[PDB]
DNA sequence: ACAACCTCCTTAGTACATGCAACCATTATCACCGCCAGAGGTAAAATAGTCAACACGCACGGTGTTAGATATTTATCCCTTGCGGTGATAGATT
């Protein structure tokens, strides 16, 4: 997730999950952590927003 | 007084425009050598220091194990092909 660049989680509560497969060794299971972590912050996955 | 005129005198003022390629030498010529400057040298001590000793102490990298990812295999699914049936187009008219 450093080499995919997402240096701000306020992408990563928007880019689609299909989207996270875009740079190697980021797989089956590093792309399930995502699933929950963010959740467990009081927060969700797939939250585009009109304005950031 | 002078005036310009006849002749060949010499003087010397000019010689259109746009562009690209190339490289930068020849001279000889005693600079003497004497003096001494601050001024080169370096010994011994300021402005301060090396790196070897014996300690100190840590980082990094490679060997080992683990992790998980990925590319394969498999098999499923959909979007696409090509033909066909027959579509309301293209556009002439109302």
């Given at each position: ?7 701000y989680?306020g ?6 999950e ?10 089956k299971?590093?792309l399930?952590?995502i699933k ?7 927060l969700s996955?797939g939250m585009?927003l009109e304005?950031?």
């Amino acid at each position: 997730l450093k080499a995919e660049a997402i240096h701000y989680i306020g992408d990563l509560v928007q880019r689609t999950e299909v989207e996270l497969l875009k740079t190697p060794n980021l797989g089956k299971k590093s792309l399930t952590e995502i699933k929950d972590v963010l959740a467990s912050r009081g927060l969700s996955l797939g939250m585009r927003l009109e304005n950031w």
